[PDB]
């Protein structure tokens, strides 16, 4: 909670949707399959948009757990399923005292739009358990996640084909592990796809390579796509590339840490890092790795030797790129005019209110929207889910076959040339480059995850760019993004007797 300008998270998102819906409404009536074309078409389009906006299902739970002391404690949880236009609903689980019905629904709706933007065939969903993880033992957290799983499973809120959870705030591999085990040990004990019931699992329990760093990596790609445009960078008056760029990230968890690791890898330097207790700062930069070790060692960043405890909001720090990677509504009407940064990389979901958004546009600040920028998580979660359904690790059945084929292919040009140039040319060795040598056997799980995500982030970046052009949206990439998501979802709703006369 802010104080002033702290919109109902759900209505806030509903606003972004509307903003984009009014922009594409014409094109939706344009290519609308109605026979009786007469602006009633315009009404049928509106009728469909009113279906998409609200969540279809919201399950509120209140269940008891036994503390390690012996006392019983009632704990509350929620799971919202926003859309089912794509069968398996998808969305993580958040553990924090801030979860409520409205937050879970806003987040659930962000999931469907983000999946749509990045072409992941999932309807959006989201869960939250209203507790503060820090105040519970590991034994208690397990009871909590496992019991929550059972309650969702009995009401149809988790299943490989109905709804697949994943991590979020204060949850990770560990919780995903308990969730999978509980589902597989009970309701899905006969299901050949029982372990595809949740993603973000540990690699040993059926998880996929780089899922933990997938979001930060996607953040790196999302930024990379726009930071090399020149066109956009000129409006912001910056030079393309990361090499001479500074950035500050609010959040040092799964998203922030890794976003930081990746930008730093490409020359950019982190001038500031923030957390709930405070922020640290250094104009000469901070190394993500020694900061991680200090965090793992002291349970905090404050007091890190090679930086100073910054005083005065990480969000207003001086930098080129600001990466809010914590919770929602961190950027509001009251602090927007003081952000300093030129690019806001939305790693978190809903970090800026529609009011800061207005201010940001007017100050010529580029805000790379969350429904695109942080989609790296679901994109790789989707690859994990796919891996579970296929029951083989990528390339296992083809490494040798491809390897031999590539050598015989190269041998084909070698023999063709030598026979064409005879003994006058001698042997003409056609050998793999060092680079191709690394790819001689074909893609591994890691290859697909890396190349697949890059492909996805770049492809979606283009569509967002192409749409912002067609509608002259300038630096309003958020509106361009929702236009794209709406176009896609609307599509499943229109086609033939699905919804028309």
Ligand X SMILES: O=C1Nc2ccc(I)cc2/C1=C\c1cc(Br)c(O)c(Br)c1
Binding positions for ligand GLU, 312-371, rule CB under 6 A: 349
Smallest distance from ligand X to CB 497, Å: 6
Q: Does residue 85 belong to the site contacting ligand X (CB under 6 A)?
A: no
Decide which of ligand GTP, ligand X, ligand NDP, none touches 292; Cβ closer than 5 to 8 Å per partner kind.
Answer: ligand GTP
Backbone dihedral region for residue 206 (phi beyond 0: left; psi -120 to 50: alpha; all else: beta) = left
Q: Which is nearer to ligand NDP, 281 or 490 (CB)?
A: 281
Decide which of ligand NDP, ligand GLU, ligand GTP, none touches 210; Cβ closer than 5 to 8 Å per partner kind.
Answer: ligand GTP
DSSP, residue by residue, 451-486: HHHHHHHHHHHHHHHHHHHHTT-TT-HHHHHHHHHH
Q: Which residue has the tokens 């940001």?
A: 360
What is the distance between the alpha carbons of residues 348 and 369, in angstroms, rounded to a whole number?
10
User: Who's near 1: CB < 8 A, 6+ residues apart?
Assistant: none
Residue selected from 166, 208, 317, 341 as contacting ligand GLU according to rule CB under 6 A: 166
Whether 126 is a known active-site residue: answer: yes
Smallest distance from ligand X to CB 85, Å: 14
- Determine whether 367 is exposed, middle or buried from the number of CB atoms within 10 Å of its CB (0-12, 13-18, 19+): buried
Site string for ligand NDP, 243-282 (x = CB under 6 A): -------xxxxxx------------------xxxx-----
Please answer whether residues 367 and 352 qualify as being in contact, where contact means their C-beta atoms are separated by less than 8 angstroms: yes
Q: According to CB under 8 A, which residues from 27 to 66 bind its own copies? A: 43-44, 47-48, 50-51, 54-64
Total residues at interface with its own copies (CB under 8 A) = 115
Q: Which is nearer to its own copies, 202 or 474 (CB)?
A: 202
Site string for ligand X, 116-155 (x = CB under 6 A): --------------------------xx--xx--x-----
Q: Does residue 92 belong to the site contacting ligand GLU (CB under 6 A)?
A: yes
Q: Are strands 321-324 and 279-286 parallel, antiparallel or unpaired?
A: unpaired
Show the tokens assigned to 151: 């309650």
Decide which of ligand NDP, ligand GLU, its own copies, none touches 148; Cβ closer than 5 to 8 Å per partner kind.
Answer: none
Smallest distance from its own copies to CB 173, Å: 7
What is the distance between the alpha carbons of residues 171 and 212, in angstroms, rounded to a whole number?
11
Q: Which is nearer to its own copies, 258 or 387 (CB)?
A: 387
What is the distance between the alpha carbons of residues 29 and 285, in angstroms, rounded to a whole number?
51
Residue selected from 170, 205, 335, 499 as contacting ligand NDP according to rule CB under 6 A: 170
What is the distance between the alpha carbons of residues 8 and 30, in angstroms, rounded to a whole number?
33
- Judged by the rule CB under 6 A, the positions of this chain that interact with ligand GTP are 210, 212-213, 257, 261, 289, 292, 446
- Determine whether 128 is exposed, middle or buried from the number of CB atoms within 10 Å of its CB (0-12, 13-18, 19+): buried
- The helix (run of H) or strand (run of E) holding residue 316 is none
Q: Which is nearer to ligand NDP, 233 or 325 (CB)?
A: 325
Q: Are strands 269-274 and 246-250 parallel, antiparallel or unpaired?
A: parallel
The torsion of the CA quartet 296, 302, 307, 310, rounded to 10 degrees, works out to 150
Nearest to 449 by CA among 382, 370, 372: 382
DSSP, residue by residue, 4-52: SS---HHHHHHHHHHHHHHHHHHHHHHT---SS-SSHHHHHHHHHHHHH
- CA atoms 239, 242, 247, 249: torsion sign: positive
Out of 41, 105, 114, 126, pick the active-site residue: 126
Q: Does residue 484 belong to the site contacting ligand NDP (CB under 6 A)?
A: no
What is the distance between the alpha carbons of residues 169 and 200, in angstroms, rounded to a whole number?
13
Decide which of ligand X, ligand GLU, ligand GTP, none touches 379; Cβ closer than 5 to 8 Å per partner kind.
Answer: none
User: Nearest to ligand GLU by Cβ — which residue?
Assistant: 92
Smallest distance from ligand GLU to CB 352, Å: 16
Decide which of ligand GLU, ligand GTP, its own copies, none touches 23; Cβ closer than 5 to 8 Å per partner kind.
Answer: none
Site string for ligand X, 186-215 (x = CB under 6 A): x-----------------------------
Decide which of ligand X, ligand NDP, ligand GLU, none touches 250; Cβ closer than 5 to 8 Å per partner kind.
Answer: ligand NDP
Which residues are bridge partners to 163 per DSSP?
Answer: 89, 159
DSSP-based three-state secondary structure for 166: coil
Residue selected from 20, 92, 159, 218 as contacting its own copies according to rule CB under 8 A: 159
Smallest distance from its own copies to CB 485, Å: 15
Q: Which residue has the tokens 């998501």?
A: 485
Decide which of ligand GTP, ligand NDP, its own copies, none touches 71; Cβ closer than 5 to 8 Å per partner kind.
Answer: its own copies
Q: Which is nearer to ligand NDP, 49 or 125 (CB)?
A: 125
H-type helices in 70-172, by residue range?
A: 101-117, 138-154
Query: What Å distances lie between residue 441 and 96, 393, 396, 402, 407, CA to CA?
Result: 45, 14, 10, 5, 10
Q: Does residue 168 belong to the site contacting ligand NDP (CB under 6 A)?
A: yes
Decide which of ligand GTP, ligand NDP, its own copies, none touches 276; Cβ closer than 5 to 8 Å per partner kind.
Answer: ligand NDP
Q: Does residue 391 belong to the site contacting its own copies (CB under 8 A)?
A: yes
Q: List, by residue number, the catalytic residues.
A: 126
Residues in contact with ligand NDP by CB under 6 A are 92, 166-170, 215, 250-255, 274-277, 325-327, 347-349, 374, 377
Residues in contact with ligand X by CB under 6 A are 142-143, 146-147, 150, 181-182, 185-186
């Amino acid at each position: 909670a802010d104080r002033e300008d702290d919109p109902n998270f759900f209505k806030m998102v509903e606003g972004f949707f509307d903003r984009g819906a009014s922009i594409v409404e014409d094109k939706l009536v344009e290519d609308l399959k109605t026979r009786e074309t007469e602006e009633q078409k315009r009404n049928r389009v509106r009728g469909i948009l009113r279906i998409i906006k609200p969540c279809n299902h919201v399950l509120s739970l209140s269940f008891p757990i036994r503390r390690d002391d012996g006392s019983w404690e009632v704990i509350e949880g929620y799971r919202a399923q926003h859309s089912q236009h794509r069968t398996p609903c998808k969305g993580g689980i958040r553990y924090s005292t801030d979860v409520s019905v409205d937050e879970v629904k806003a987040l659930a709706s962000l999931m469907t739009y983000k999946c749509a933007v990045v072409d992941v065939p999932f309807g959006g969903a989201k869960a939250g358990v209203k507790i503060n993880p820090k105040n519970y033992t590991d034994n208690e957290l397990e009871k909590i996640t496992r019991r929550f799983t059972m309650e969702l499973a009995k009401k149809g809120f988790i299943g490989p084909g109905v709804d697949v959870p994943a991590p979020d705030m204060s949850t990770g591999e560990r919780e995903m592990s308990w969730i999978a085990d509980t589902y597989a040990s009970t309701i899905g004990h006969y299901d050949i796809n029982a372990h595809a019931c949740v993603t973000g699992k540990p690699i040993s329990q059926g998880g996929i390579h780089g899922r933990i760093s997938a979001t930060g990596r996607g953040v790196f790609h999302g930024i990379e796509n726009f930071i090399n445009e020149a066109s956009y960078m000129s409006i912001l008056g910056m030079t393309p590339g990361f090499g001479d760029k500074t950035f500050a990230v609010q959040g040092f968890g799964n998203v922030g840490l890794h976003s930081m690791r990746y930008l730093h890898r490409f020359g950019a330097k982190c001038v500031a890092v923030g957390e709930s207790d405070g922020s640290i700062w250094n104009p000469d930069g901070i190394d993500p790795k020694e900061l991680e070790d200090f965090k793992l060692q002291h349970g905090t960043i404050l007091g890190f030797p090679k930086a100073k405890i910054y005083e005065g909001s990480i969000l207003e720090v001086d930098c080129d790129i600001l990466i809010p990677a914590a919770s929602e509504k961190q950027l509001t009407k009251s602090n927007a005019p003081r952000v300093k940064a030129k690019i806001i990389a939305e790693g978190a979901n809903g970090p800026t209110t529609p009011e800061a958004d207005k201010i940001f546009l007017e100050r010529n600040i580029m805000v790379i929207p969350d429904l695109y920028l942080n989609a790296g998580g679901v994109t790789v979660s989707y690859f994990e889910w796919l891996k579970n359904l296929n029951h083989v690790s990528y390339g296992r059945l083809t490494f040798k076959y491809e390897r031999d084929s590539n050598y015989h292919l190269l041998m084909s040009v070698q023999e063709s040339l030598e026979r064409k140039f005879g003994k006058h040319g001698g042997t003409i060795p056609i050998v793999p480059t060092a680079e191709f040598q690394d790819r001689i056997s074909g893609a591994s799980e890691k290859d697909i995850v890396h190349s697949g995500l890059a492909y996805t982030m770049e492809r979606s970046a283009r569509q967002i760019m192409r749409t912002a052009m067609k509608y002259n949206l300038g630096l309003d990439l958020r509106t361009a993004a929702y236009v794209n998501a709406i176009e896609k979802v609307f599509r499943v709703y229109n086609e033939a007797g699905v919804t028309f006369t």
